[PDB]
Amino acid sequence: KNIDGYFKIYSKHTPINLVRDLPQGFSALEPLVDLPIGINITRFQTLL
């Protein structure tokens, strides 16, 4: 997310045993990175 020119990144990792869908159970994402970049964002694209 973007707030006041900060770009904020949160993350989590877990094992999974259903291939089809995201897990029905609950887990929460701790912060990892926070960048003071001051940039307009309206599009994104992943990289493989």
Partner: peptide, 24 residues
């Protein structure tokens, strides 16, 4: 502070066009 001894000549290079956003 006034930088009148450093940045004056005149000097025409110094340019003007949400918080902390750089509109380049």
């Amino acid at each position: 502070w006034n930088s009148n001894n450093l940045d004056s000549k005149g000097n025409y290079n110094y340019l003007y066009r949400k918080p902390f956003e750089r509109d380049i």
